[PDB]
Amino acid sequence: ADDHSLSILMLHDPEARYLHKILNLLPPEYYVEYPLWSNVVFALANTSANYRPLAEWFSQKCPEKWNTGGKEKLEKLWNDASRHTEKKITKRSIMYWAHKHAPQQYKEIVEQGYFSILAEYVYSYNGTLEHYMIAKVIYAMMGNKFVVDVDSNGKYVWFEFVLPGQPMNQGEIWKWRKEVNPDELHIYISENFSRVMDRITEHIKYHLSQPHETNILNYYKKLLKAFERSKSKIFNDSFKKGVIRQAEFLFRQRSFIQTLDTNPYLLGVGNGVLSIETIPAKLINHFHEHPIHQYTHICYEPFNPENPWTKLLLNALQDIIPELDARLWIMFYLSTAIFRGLKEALMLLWLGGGCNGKTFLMRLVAMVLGDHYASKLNISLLTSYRETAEKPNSAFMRLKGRG
Amino acid sequence: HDTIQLTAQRKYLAEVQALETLLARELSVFLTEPGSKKTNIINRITGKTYALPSTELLRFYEHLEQCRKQGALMYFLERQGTYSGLMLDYDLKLNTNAAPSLESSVLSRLCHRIFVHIKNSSVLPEGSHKIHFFFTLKPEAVQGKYGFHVLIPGLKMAASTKKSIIASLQHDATVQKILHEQGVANPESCLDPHSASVPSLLYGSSKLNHRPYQLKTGFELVFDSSDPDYIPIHQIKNIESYNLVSELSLTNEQGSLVRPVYCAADPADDHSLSILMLHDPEARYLHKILNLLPPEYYVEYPLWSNVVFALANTSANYRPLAEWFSQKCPEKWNTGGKEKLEKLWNDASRHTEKKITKRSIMYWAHKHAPQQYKEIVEQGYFSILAEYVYSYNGTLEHYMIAKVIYAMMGNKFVVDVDSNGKYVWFEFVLPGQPMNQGEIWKWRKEVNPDELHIYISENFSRVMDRITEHIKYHLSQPHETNILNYYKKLLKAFERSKSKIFNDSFKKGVIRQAEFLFRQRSFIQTLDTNPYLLGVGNGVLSIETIPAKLINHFHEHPIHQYTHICYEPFNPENPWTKLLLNALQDIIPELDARLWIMFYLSTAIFRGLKEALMLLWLGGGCNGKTFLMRLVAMVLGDHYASKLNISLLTSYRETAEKPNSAFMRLKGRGYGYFEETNKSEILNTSRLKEMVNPGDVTARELNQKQESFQMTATMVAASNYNFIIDTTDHGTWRRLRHYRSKVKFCHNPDPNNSYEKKEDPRFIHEYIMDPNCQNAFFSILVYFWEKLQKEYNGQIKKVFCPTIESETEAYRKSQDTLHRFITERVVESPSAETVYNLSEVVTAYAEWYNANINVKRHIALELSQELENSVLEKYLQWSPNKTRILKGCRILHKFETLQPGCEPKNKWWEWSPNP
Amino acid sequence: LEHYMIAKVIYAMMGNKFVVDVDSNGKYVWFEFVLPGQPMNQGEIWKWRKEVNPDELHIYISENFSRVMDRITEHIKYHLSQPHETNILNYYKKLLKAFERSKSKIFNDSFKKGVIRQAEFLFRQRSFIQTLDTNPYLLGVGNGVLSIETIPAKLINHFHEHPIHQYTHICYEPFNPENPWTKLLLNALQDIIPELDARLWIMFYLSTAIFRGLKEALMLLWLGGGCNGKTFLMRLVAMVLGDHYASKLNISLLTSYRETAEKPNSAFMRLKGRGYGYFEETNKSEILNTSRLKEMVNPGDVTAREQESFQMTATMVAASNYNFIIDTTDHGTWRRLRHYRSKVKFCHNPDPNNSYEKKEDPRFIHEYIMDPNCQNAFFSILVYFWEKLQKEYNGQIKKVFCPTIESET
DNA sequence: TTTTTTTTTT
Ligand SMILES: Nc1ncnc2c1ncn2[C@@H]1O[C@H](COP(=O)(O)OP(=O)(O)NP(=O)(O)O)[C@@H](O)[C@H]1O
Ligand SMILES: Nc1ncnc2c1ncn2[C@@H]1O[C@H](COP(=O)(O)OP(=O)(O)NP(=O)(O)O)[C@@H](O)[C@H]1O
Ligand SMILES: Nc1ncnc2c1ncn2[C@@H]1O[C@H](COP(=O)(O)OP(=O)(O)NP(=O)(O)O)[C@@H](O)[C@H]1O
Ligand SMILES: [Mg+2]
């Protein structure tokens, strides 16, 4: 049975079966090249601890590499997956890669999965659908696009990953935006989920047309009547509200809010997210699993001295600060505003007679960092005595999360 | 399993309901308590005992026969008194599975020999009489074992004669051979010796979880005084039409055909456990569960004591279960176990330190035997849902589902009312489930029990499916048309009510009703009260004993707060441990000062009362002040440690009403520190003595009312300037300690200065965020706490440290003028006693202050009260006139010249274990 | 069946165990009398507990009323099986069908909520809250209720109808002079006060802390001569009386000048309905204010709040190391003050040559004041002293003869 | 809703 452990996992975990169907769609480079294979192994390990048979089967797609140290490679990669706390990818990346490399096969496979789940639920309860059933199907449909977690107020808060094309505010692409009410989920329950019910109706009508025993035909007719009665409830406001309220328990992800925007080396920009972990800095215009919510409206571009605006800004900086060493130190100090982590205990005091460009540069830095990362501070916060004992102080609260 | 059959029959059989109504309403006039002599009929299904006269006995027989006519199952035993009919019970063991037919010829031969025995062993009434015989046979042979009964209602005998006949029959070779030739392989022991006096089963009744016997045929024996030799036996016919309940009753007096032959005449402890089982389903479930435990739990004293304590804590009346469990080993029980059980039960009624309940027993049973535990508990779930399904015709409601859910997961969720008056759910986080980092093996707070929401729709649906399968199976069984119609209606109603568990409002109602069942009084009150238990990232750490133990298994300690730091045993060879020890060596040069500081900071682990000391740090900057204190706060976490605002210690408090959440940040904190102060800072002495003392303080929290809590935090303060303490109170100064920095970290240190060191940014930028260094420092703190406990009995006041005491004395002397006077002029000279009055000493102080410090107009009473505020209380006795007099000291009054009268070698953390 | 019928039957079944009344906020509040053998907090037995939601009533609706429902069903089935005319049989069949339709509603959350909401009118008892804990001769304890209205004091361990809600966790026991904790406390108390007449006067004054009504209101100026370690006995009195009956007060209340016409004062809201109040640990040698004494020492309703007014019932003790300054000649103030100076200290490293310095023992403060046995022994001592005062001097502390107190005052 | 905030006090 050790050789059949993959099938043992298949019979017990529907998600493992769905992944196995999905993994066959990946092009050959994802098991031939070491980086892609390692990424797939890491994603499988992070998704579930018992998904090792799937990784072993996938690594056997190239037996020559598997025999030449692949087994030990798989073993130490599996160990590092528990060891490595930085390689945070899951089944979402695998699904995205499969969808990118084969849209039609991925679409038909996942639609077959949806239909199987809904058909099982319909048959089990004679077509009387309820909130939890549609909640389960909707979680199957979008388990990797919405995440809900309990905030500090004890209120469930919905988050959505923004993809290109969908309506959005400017600059919130490739990030987890916060939804007061899951609008897209409400639209999806009535628009897209209704077509699966059409497939169920087609299946029932096809079985009715099929010649069967009179008892079987009567049972199918009663099932069709019940399903038609229960079909229109997905357009009801109260029913959808109950469905989404029940779906909050399935979309729940523990410690999602705790890890949101905690990495100081990742900076959200207008055209994606900017990673300054290693030089040169890289812009992420593609799918990623970094939990980043806050952002600035500025679109990042590589530094170019020949840009007319760059020339104008450099000339202005030269005009404002004559001395070269002073100019370099000021630019170095202001550049640390990009990083949101612990840094040197320094403060800069700038004195001037007036009308000498002080507020221009200081405010330009805050304008380019945006409100989520930069803020003006009240002078009374620095030259006045502290409030007595305990009183609320929103001026001091502005200091949280800002660089 | 008989419970399901009993409930079903009481539902769909109207005759069973009529019989029960008779037994509870009309025959209720003849109730008898157990053990009464009047008892003649017993219903052991309910355990009740009865005494019915002849007419009421006939009525009862009629109603059972009507119930027997419909194939109902019951268990009624007639109490055979001193004089009743003879009974013979045989349990047959066979060579093969072939059933011995017990042919009427063989039965006739056996009856002939039995009559020979009874006639030769007892006297018979004169004349001619007829004796009726009947034979009930077992339905099947199991593993070659069989049985049959020979009941003789007509032969009214005494117990002694019946027992003698049974013994003779057992020892008779003729009857043994007769049985052997039919197929009985154990004729010598088939007949039960106690058959004379055991209660007789009324026909149609069957033993608990046993199938009823089948009546094969009846025989009648005719004997005459004038013809005592020939023994004719006639087979009884028309046996299907008689009221067999009456005709097979041994004690019956008014039988239709049975006529009495007036021939010769001559413990509650076991019932208590059955009574407890019947009156409490949980006791029955525990009795089923306790059998799964391995023999160690009743042989070894610790495990047996733990089981006894858990049973006693679960319920006060669960003693019979403990007594039965202890009887698993007769040798150990007989050799003093009774007295041990008495003492342990008394202690459980007394003690309150071993807090274990049925949760631990369930966990042990699941660990040792998972499949059997699962089967038993799932059978319990199905049984519990069965009564609710049957009694209300499938219309399930919120309260029914809440009861089943509590029975299913009662040992994992607890709900209690907080201060706000709102019900708050708690869950015990077992491994292998989604959970935040470090909250494993602890009670976590949930706004909404989403796990219960998932559980209702995912696991309870399986019990629903089992109920549906049971209903379908009963439908497929051949039954009366009325029974089939009733089951069809029940199935329709249940199917209508089956999908309610997926509805949002229904689940909300079920959980709202379940809050009443899961409620546990005083759970929040006892939460996190124990100071010797500290929650950690990989379990819970127990510092109750030396060495400390890490609990990675099931426990019932009510612990909620925790720190994310994972505990590991102290190891000096760990690179992070070496790095931290070298950093400590660098931060504090003096060995005794370093030891005292580490011992003081080790007390931050303990969240109880302590020696009421506060540490004051002095340093110019860049000397590790923030690093060490913040490292302690980081390793202790937010729940146990917090930075404090300095205004909370240097200002007049807000009105009690005014919440003051900053003050509420001191609740439950083992450590608190203020990292920032002003150049010119006067600490408020009233605040200081209010916060360092072991005692109660009160303040309000946001969305809560007035509340008082003990003050149990280790207080540390750091600044660039000396604090100002405007008092000479000896009680205030004994609470304070002061230390001044020596080593300074800088980018370019002077090699000629041992107090200048090269700084390393990593200490505060990286070596305070790596979890490895955090947990190494936590291990160091635990080791130092253990060292303090084992060397100074936990009293920080007895730690020898010349540097700290000298610097504190200097700090006090720099502000306390009268302390300067006493230290420099008032010498404790036993050779210069020179008893002084308090006014003389006050004059001396005035002269000294005017001449040496500053000219000032003094007040005698104030000065006297202030030298009552000093160390002079050691000598200030009472004069015969009750005036304060100084004794045993010499005063240097005015300008008087004064008159007479270790380095660590290799491991500084293991320095001097011998002092 | 509808909500009001089940509410009526539930009142008939449990009308003598639950009482509901409207509080000052306009909300109906349920109260339950706690009998032995039911889940409860430690010490709430034989008293009324405040219930935000009647959990026990909710359980009782679905757990015990179902038996009455079953009796009704049995009656209906018995009549149905009885030989009757076809019309009566049809009527009983219809009645049984309707009852079975209505039988399962008692397990519904909304139905039970409506039943309890309708029951709030039947269980209503006017002016029940206003009479709670008004009797000063009844004191709620951990093992029942203590009554001091008669000599000797009597403990109640059976059913009673006194409206008592508040209590102290101290369990009452008869004063046994040979008990180890009683002996230890008696020896320490003898050590604290050397003078016998002063000791008896102090204990008789302190025993009045149990009684929660009006009394002579004489302030005691206990000057802790020698820095005795005053916290022990004074905090022990408040510990045995508990927070519901004893209050900690700040010395700033007596030294600060009278407030402005609108400024809120934090002390009087925590002072109401108490039997004991204490001031401790002076170090600034604060000057006391005469209007602040008049604000409380004279019997009558106090007016400053945070406006609200009420009567004064707390037994007051002022503990000082360094003498207060009373800047008045008013005989009306001096006649209400009493002064005593101690002569003994218990501290670390005392001189063996004098009895007035004794070896300290930190375990006293660290465990013994937290030890329940010490607390209940001290409570028994207080009860005995109150009984002795009542039976000897009729409870008036004015007429207690004590030369030491008079001379030192 | 209901509380906290604000108001009010320092
Ligand atoms: N590089 C530059 N060349 C020319 N004009 C400039 C330049 N930078 C800023 N200015 C202008 O100089 C003026 C002063 O700028 P501003 O930053 O507002 O002054 P400031 O130094 O902060 N003075 P003040 O706040 O009044 O004490 C504005 O009109 C700017 O547009
Ligand atoms: N053991 C050490 N070895 C080397 N460098 C250290 C060590 N401990 C601390 N540091 C350095 O000390 C510097 C300042 O320490 P820090 O504790 O933040 O200053 P501080 O003494 O609190 N001064 P201040 O902030 O003014 O209160 C850090 O940036 C580290 O580089
Ligand atoms: N009767 C006694 N016998 C022996 N030791 C005692 C006695 N009474 C008190 N002590 C000890 O004397 C010390 C005084 O404790 P405490 O009552 O807190 O003093 P204090 O000066 O009133 N304190 P505080 O108001 O907090 O500054 C403690 O160590 C007590 O344990
Ligand atoms: Mg610092």
Numbering used by the authors:
A (entry chain B): 285 to 687
B (entry chain A): 9 to 274, 284 to 918, 936 to 949
C (entry chain F): 413 to 718, 723 to 825
From the article:
Here, we report the structural and biochemical studies of the highly conserved C962R protein of ASFV, showing that C962R is a multidomain protein. The N-terminal AEP domain is responsible for the DNA polymerization activity, whereas the DNA unwinding activity is catalyzed by the central SF3 helicase domain. The middle PriCT2 and D5_N domains and the C-terminal Tail domain all contribute to the DNA unwinding activity of C962R. C962R preferentially works on forked DNA, and likely functions in Base-excision repair (BER) or other repair pathway in ASFV.
To reveal the detailed basis for DNA unwinding by C962R, we carried out cryo-EM study for C962R in the presence of both DNA and AMPPNP. Therefore, instead of regular dsDNAs or dsDNAs with 3′-overhang, ssDNA was directly utilized in the cryo-EM study of the C962R-DNA-AMPPNP complex. However, different from the apo-form C962R structure, the two C962R hexamers are tilted with respect to each other in the ternary complex structure. Since the tilting angle varies from one particle to another, we only modeled one C962R hexamer in the final structure. In the complex structure, six AMPPNP molecules were captured by the C962R hexamer. The α and β phosphate groups of AMPPNP form four H-bond interactions with the main chain atoms of the Walker A motif (Gly638-Phe644); the γ phosphate group interacts with the side chain of Lys642 and Asn737. The DNA is located in the central channel of the C962R hexamer. Although no stable interaction was observed for the nucleobases, the backbones of the DNA form extensive H-bond interactions with C962R, especially Arg717 and Asn720 of the helicase domains. The two loops are termed DNA-interacting loop (DIL) 1 and 2, respectively. Both DIL-1 and DIL-2 loops are well defined in the complex structures, whereas they are completely disordered in the apo structure. The SF3 helicase domains are symmetrically arranged in the apo C962R structure, whereas they adopt an asymmetric conformation in the complex structure.
